[PDB]
Amino acid sequence: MGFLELDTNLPANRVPAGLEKRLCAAAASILGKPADRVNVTVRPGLAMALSGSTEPCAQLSISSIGVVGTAEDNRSHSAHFFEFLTKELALGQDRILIRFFPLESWQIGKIGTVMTFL
Amino acid sequence: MGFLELDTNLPANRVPAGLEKRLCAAAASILGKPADRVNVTVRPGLAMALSGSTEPCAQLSISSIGVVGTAEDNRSHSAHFFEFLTKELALGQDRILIRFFPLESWQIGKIGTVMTFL
Amino acid sequence: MGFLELDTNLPANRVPAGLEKRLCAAAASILGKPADRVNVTVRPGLAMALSGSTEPCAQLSISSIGVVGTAEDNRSHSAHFFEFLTKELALGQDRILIRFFPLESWQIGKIGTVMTFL
Ligand code: NA
Ligand code: NA
Ligand code: NA
């Protein structure tokens, strides 16, 4: 399972509509998951500085069981997510950063239990 | 100490008013803490996909010193938080997920120090 | 590199304008980084309880490579961030909490790779 959170200082009406769905599909493909095991949250209109600058930017966080635990894996993911997001948001590559967080099954609550038991 | 963050794509005017307080009380009871050691943040009106779907949903994160570090503990918490949130938000159990994060006292800043020293 | 996220239940028009920039500068100084290696996200207008109370409050999270991994380091940071934020937000010291999260270079995506390779 994958969880993506995207904070941006672009106003909601400057984020291309439906981005949460397209990022869900992109993340399924990049991380190697079916679309029904991917989650995306987009939070626009925030006040942000990225690398010291308040120019338009976005911060992506990716959490996942399994696939985000090494530099080699995350370098690959990063290349693809930067390509996707720079194009969608009309941002330079200097205006996006990503954080990757490994998760374990005992940490994910699903249908009233945790994934350890599913 | 417990910290709960709830993201939802329900508009603010569709989230039952006061949910942050009722979730604080529920989390105190579920996690085994007095209400004054529990924190809740609700972020409505977001653009979200959960399990690949943009239908109404919510994502809960629970961070805590002590009580969220095993599958057995988190299964118990999950059952109770799913019962609470499905009813409050009028959501099916397929429309909520939870992530659990253990914290340590050196990670929590309180009154200008950290909890290690309190 | 440092990442700060600040959630508050103060409405956007009650947060002193430009706080994301001033917090970026403060965090550069406190954490020992140049301003171009610091990131800040402010999310106002949220529904929050802190220590069981829905009175005005703020939650700060600080993630960083290197400097947030011990009680001694975080006690020092906490004193300075509490001084900065209590004054900016006109909040008592009981109305702010901080969480600190160490990061490693393989977890940070930057310019289409990860920091391990930069
Ligand atoms: Na997280
Ligand atoms: Na967190
Ligand atoms: Na984080």
Author numbering:
A (entry chain A), B (entry chain A), C (entry chain A): 0 to 117
Please quote the authors directly.
An evolutionarily conserved proline at the N terminus acts as the catalytic base for a tautomerization reaction of unknown biological significance in both proteins. The same site in MIF-2 is Phe100 and is also evolutionarily conserved among all MIF-2 proteins, suggesting this site plays an important role in both proteins.
Mutation of Pro1 abolished activity, supporting the critical role of the N-terminal proline in the HPP enol-keto tautomerase reaction for MIF-2. The P1G MIF-2 variant has no catalytic activity because of the dynamics of the glycine and the altered pKa preventing it from functioning as a catalytic base, which is also observed for P1G MIF. This conclusion is supported by the F100A and S62A variants, which should have the same proline pKa as wt-MIF-2 and possess catalytic activity. We were surprised to find the initiating Met of the P1G MIF-2 variant, as it is cleaved by Escherichia coli methionine aminopeptidase in the P1G MIF protein. Crystal structures of MIF variants and substrate- or inhibitor-bound complexes typically display very few differences, and consistent with this trend, the P1G and S62A variants have RMSD values of 0.30 Å and 0.32 Å with the wt-MIF-2 trimer, respectively. Proline 1 mutation has a large influence on the MIF-2 structure in solution, whereas the F100A mutant had more modest chemical shift perturbations by comparison. However, subtle elevation in the dynamics of residues 20 to 30 distal to the monomer–monomer interface and decreases in residues 60 to 75 surrounding the allosteric pathway along the solvent cavity are observed in P1G MIF-2.
